Symmetry: C2
């Protein structure tokens, strides 16, 4: 765009001057492989690998790497990529959104960077919108990879707990946006390291970037499993404890705990009727379920800590004592009070793990994608994925008829014109693609021409193979196809035999979409490789989008000027209007996702903290450093809670502390006032620990030298997992709670952060506390297997919208 306003195309100009050159270097060395045996070529792949760990960077081999591919494809598929293709390739390697007009060869272009990167067995994921496309792709573009001697694994949800590891092992993997996503999640529920399917996320290449990264990313991904019909044992806990109140179950107010060790009259009473002798196994199920109820009676008082109404037990802040915005007590204490207050114990289906697509594709060390429409939603990327959109030239200059919209006053009147258009287009033998927006509108224009005497076929998503198949012959002489919302993305329409002369593929848009791209993709279904074609979008004045944009004035002045009598009518101050209005829709959808990501952004600061810590455990040589560290961690909090800010120097309730450490870490009569009397908190913490460790040793010596590990791993998993799943649900709960009652000075997103982080902190401290206890007071029996933390059926799904 010549003129002062040209400094905007500058950020991409120097980048296009580059890529165009790089592409010249590849075509410059097209001899080094032109006449060379398959063997040596195939061996070039290794010469490369060898050069890599020998100092060279992936970039250093780009020119050649590509060259070899460009060559290999001519052999495998008879296709020698065009400079543009080579250009798109480089872009993809640089980690950008390569926008190449729908009709070039992205599936091929992708081979270049996916290869140059895959040359280090670190993993390369090529993600597609659906399993079919992803399948087909892998097979066809695979031969190229296999030829250069590279393993290519496919990844579908139908593959086994064994197949998928292999598929992910290959140095080049094919999958869908969901599969890769859900796996990441299932990989963090794993009880045994080897159950993890994925490898560390390296480099991703997204085909149809818009669909996957934007559209399909409006809602989050999540796994969950209903809660057992066990609304039987919760009350039992309440009924049991409702008859224990005494100093036979020691309470606590400095640390607010209803511990249980020297409460033998209780730990024995707990055994009213169950496997009394055994602890470890069904004690983690009871204790963790009983204490939460015990604390519901002795610790949590009624109209002071929480409030009750004809709804659920609402919480109450200390300061302004205001009613919390839909929040519950974690670790499963909330529904323990519901038993206490009798109120209906609301049992639901809690969440297990979750992440936003936005956050997923940000994990891979490097990310990139290809499509023919990105500029539309260009700032979305740069902002959320720090990716730039580089628009790559077209193999051959475009000479297609992008006819201006034709506005109509009568809705059911325009269709008569559209239906007629296809009619004559057809009669001349020229092909036609009538794009619609809704099924109701596509079937209407369907029967609308049935009575017109024209053969046709609608596009249903019965299976993308079925759609794809139709599209194939969508450029032949009798062509008349009805595509709902672009039923075939990947499968490109090849002009029919003779169509070149009759004119081209006449694509006619029924209505107009909300975002320019969805119809820019349609409008682009013609003009492949300089092919001649005609696109025309018909637009009504009753079109739901007109009513959505508030174009009532324009609807008036149009009836005030006897216009509704002259069927067709073109106008700038209406088409340049329907676009500016679309931008507003595109600007809102972006605000949404940006609003969505920010909330998840809180979880993603939490997930990693638990995931790295969970994985670290799942896969570890020695686990004592972990477990111990957590203990000393739970001990500081304990000691510290008994030594507030100079409240009576050596006159703290020391005699009490000893009673806590004894019946929580050591044994009924271990620590003595004397052992603490006089030393500062620093010394104390160290001292109390020295006996915790010297005691911890007896465990490795007594019950097992290495059987200990398997003993630790189970309690740290049945803990970390038990709580986490609970917390993840609490977050995916209060997020919607706050949305309502919220007239606080700050904004809701902030409170989420605020209160959220606090919650996250209570769980961590809880995780530690529980861990520190069992590793000590829990003696091993027979069954020493890491036990799951959720009953049977667990589902994988992504919300439709909301």
């Amino acid at each position: 765009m010549l003129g002062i306003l040209n400094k905007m195309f500058d950020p991409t100009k120097r980048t296009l001057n580059r890529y165009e050159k790089i592409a010249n270097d590849i075509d410059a060395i097209r001899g080094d492989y032109e006449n060379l045996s398959d063997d040596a070529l195939k061996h070039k792949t290794i010469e490369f690998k060898e050069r890599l760990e020998k100092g060279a960077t992936t970039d250093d081999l780009l020119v050649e790497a590509f060259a070899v591919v460009r060559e290999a494809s001519r052999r495998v598929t008879g296709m020698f990529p065009f400079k543009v293709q080579l250009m798109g390739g480089v872009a993809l390697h640089d980690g950008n959104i390569a926008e190449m007009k729908t009709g070039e060869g992205k599936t091929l272009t992708s081979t270049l960077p996916v290869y140059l990167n895959a040359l280090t067995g670190k993993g390369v994921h090529v993600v597609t919108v659906n399993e079919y496309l992803a399948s087909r792709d892998a097979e066809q573009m695979g031969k190229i990879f296999e030829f250069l001697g590279l393993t290519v694994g496919l990844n579908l949800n139908s593959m086994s707990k064994d197949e998928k590891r292999e598929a992910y092992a290959a140095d080049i993997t094919y999958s869908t946006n969901n599969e890769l996503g859900f796996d990441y999640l299932r990989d963090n529920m794993v009880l045994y390291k080897e159950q993890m399917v994925q490898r560390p996320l390296h480099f991703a290449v997204i085909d149809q970037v818009d669909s996957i990264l934007i559209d399909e990313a409006r809602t989050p991904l999540i796994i969950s499993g209903q809660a057992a019909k066990s609304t039987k044992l919760y009350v039992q806990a309440n009924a049991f404890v409702r008859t224990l109140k005494a100093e036979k179950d020691y309470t606590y107010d400095i640390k607010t705990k209803a511990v249980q060790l020297t409460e033998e009259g209780m730990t024995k009473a707990e055994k009213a009727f169950g496997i009394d002798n055994l602890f470890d196994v069904k004690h983690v199920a009871l204790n963790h379920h009983i204490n939460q109820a015990l604390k519901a009676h002795v610790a949590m008082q009624k109209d002071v800590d929480y409030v009750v109404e004809d709804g659920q037990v609402v919480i109450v802040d200390s300061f302004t004592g205001r009613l919390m915005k839909g929040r519950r007590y974690s670790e499963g204490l909330h529904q323990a009070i519901e038993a206490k207050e009798g109120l209906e114990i609301q049992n639901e289906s809690m969440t297990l793990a979750t992440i936003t697509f936005q956050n997923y594709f940000r994990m891979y060390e490097k990310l990139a994608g290809m499509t023919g429409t990105a500029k539309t939603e260009e700032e979305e990327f740069r902002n959320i994925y720090n990716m730039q959109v580089v628009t790559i030239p077209t193999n051959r200059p475009v000479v297609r008829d992008d006819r201006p919209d034709l506005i109509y006053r009568t809705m059911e009147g325009k269709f008569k014109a559209v239906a007629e258009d296809v009619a004559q287009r057809y009669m001349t033998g020229q092909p036609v693609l009538v794009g619609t927006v809704a099924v109701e509108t596509s079937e209407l224009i369907s029967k609308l021409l049935k009575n017109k005497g024209i053969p046709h076929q609608v596009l249903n998503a019965k299976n993308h193979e079925r759609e794809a198949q139709i599209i194939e012959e969508a450029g032949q002489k009798g062509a008349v196809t009805i595509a709902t919302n672009m039923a075939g993305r990947g499968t490109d329409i090849k002009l029919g035999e003779g169509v070149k002369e009759l004119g081209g593929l006449a694509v006619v848009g029924t209505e107009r979409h909300e975002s320019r791209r969805i119809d820019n993709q349609l409008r682009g279904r013609s003009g492949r490789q300089g092919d001649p074609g005609i696109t025309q979008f018909y637009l009504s004045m009753e079109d739901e989008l007109m009513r959505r944009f508030g174009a009532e004035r324009t609807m008036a002045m149009l009836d005030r000027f006897g216009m509704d009598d002259s069927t067709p009518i073109q106008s700038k101050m209406v088409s340049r209007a329907v676009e500016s209005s679309q931008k507003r829709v595109e600007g809102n959808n972006f605000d949404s996702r940006k609003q969505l990501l920010q909330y998840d952004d809180v979880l993603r600061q939490q997930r990693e903290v638990i995931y790295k810590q969970r994985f670290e455990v799942i896969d570890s040589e020695n686990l004592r450093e972990i477990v111990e560290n957590m203990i000393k961690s739970s001990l500081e909090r304990a000691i510290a809670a008994y030594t507030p800010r100079e409240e009576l120097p050596e006159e703290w309730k020391l005699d009490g502390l000893v009673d806590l450490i004894n019946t929580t870490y050591l044994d009924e009569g271990a620590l003595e006032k004397s052992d603490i009397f006089g030393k500062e908190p620093d010394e104390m913490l160290e001292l109390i620990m020295d006996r915790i460790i010297t005691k911890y040793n007896e465990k490795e010596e007594q019950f097992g030298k290495e059987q200990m590990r398997e003993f630790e791993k189970v309690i740290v998993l049945r803990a970390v997992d038990s709580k986490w799943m609970d917390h993840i649900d609490a977050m995916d709960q209060l997020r919607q709670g706050i949305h309502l009652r919220a007239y606080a000075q700050t904004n809701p997103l902030r409170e989420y952060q605020m209160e959220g982080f606090a919650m996250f902190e209570h769980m961590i401290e809880s995780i530690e506390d529980e861990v520190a206890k069992f590793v000590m007071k829990a003696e091993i029996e027979n069954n020493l297997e890491r036990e799951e933390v959720v009953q049977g059926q667990t589902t994988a799904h992504q919300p439709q919208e909301g």
Copy 2:
């Protein structure tokens, strides 16, 4: 923080393990300079410079560079920096916020990175909050720089249109956050290249980063000058034109122009009474002022293009024909209609240039800052300045009494306790710093102890030197200082002779602030270098912050428990509450600034486009490539507007186009229908240009071979500037307009973007159009000097708040 929740300190841990090591390498080579002549040392600075353009990177010389400085300071000031200091230095070089507890030696620490970076004469700005501090600093820490043989220039608004260039020339400059900001702006009003004071912004080092980058950055910086009392000639235009309607002033509807060339009966009529013969000089003032009025009558119709009310002439959209959100017609056409419609021609004081601090400090290739409090507003940085906050250790471990807040029921009751505290603190001879929040509160506690019989002194910002001076002796035995809001930032309080034993500096906070930092800075005024001290914040239940946080419940339960009888009272569920509430305030202020920056972010995409283009002109060898390019640019729009989308192939209103190009680019009878008849838009544009250039040549040949340049530069500046200032005001206007009437589907910030960019586009096209015309139809006379674009007085200022 030992425990599972330790993975949060990991991002900074590996970074601190590093810097701590780097510091060891410097102290490792402390011999290479320990016993070495001043000459060789001073020469080391050059050995370095020599190594740089010889391949070495700034980092490569870090260890040594620092070493030399560490050494040089021991010589200059007798101070040999501590490892921590060396550590802070590295941080600052890496482009981070070095948070070093208030009391270390940042002003010294800064020397290290400011030196290592300044070793390439690219410029290094060390910005301070006020001119004094910035002054003092430069002098004292300058000796170190001068010693190593480096020029240090100071920068105050009191320096001349010549002094400041020098000051900026030095390889290490000292200034204030405003000076540097305002200069950048004045540097883009410059008519003659050499009037620019600054050099390309290289590396900045901000002392008191919070103050400058955050606080002082809540409001934007801006320059503006009232409009002439010339509400006399606007109406004259209206009165003049109101008697011309005819085909003697050719109108246009395809391009909507009221051009003037072949309108001799008009260009002569224009000369009713003024320097008739002369054009160029007062014609740019008239024509640009007359046509806007002429177009107000012939082109802009009344109740269709714009609406009129008892207010200003509101605009009206084409589509929904809704009332624009406070917008005006740029280039000065808006108030031309006010003449036409008689409505009061609202004359104000328009803006000239403007930028947000946020956007300023982002320009420097690298940025960094130092302070003793950053973690508080930590995410602010990482988010807006992509800077990390690295908390640097303390030279010596801190052993100071951070006593817990003391809540009081009676407001005027707590002061009696506070006033008494200082009283006994004083009587023992120990020093005391009573920090307040408002002047009214500081003077109260002032007279409150006057009647108590205690000597003291309040802190007024009469001049930071006066404040600083007081602070100096604020650690002596009779010390009793009243600081409003930290009257002395830089000047640190050195413990008095003997105070070490009496205890230390007892800092007592009157009230509590909104953001924890402002009082974390206060609380930090003690404990310098492990010094012993006591800090105590007194807090009332009537404290304006309590009322601001909504702590009424807590106010109740406190009177419902006979507490208001026991004067002092400490509590967690109140102090840990006043903090969480403060975070909410800090989270809002951030949202504000983030909201502010985003709006400016639109301008900063516009400023650079005009600034680079303006500077490019201001400083150029040949200007024909520019001017021509703009012409061909204004020509495409012209030709194009006459050749719409296939509207009658060769049957465009061709005969009309010729009439346009003739009386707008060439001459009354130049272009012919024949010359265009048959060729496509591509050919036409090229053809029409070929005569525009071959004609353009006659200008260089006729009036001047190089006098042309000075002819171009004036019209391109009196254009680009005239419009820009107008546009910048329009933006700084409609921003507030939209804020009200706005129930559109999209959010206001979006509309700003939307409509803004559109406006920006009309100005650019206008800039070009005007330029293209004058370069042709304007003949040179005598005065060929670049003329200013604003009358006299122009002010520099930053809004208090809003």
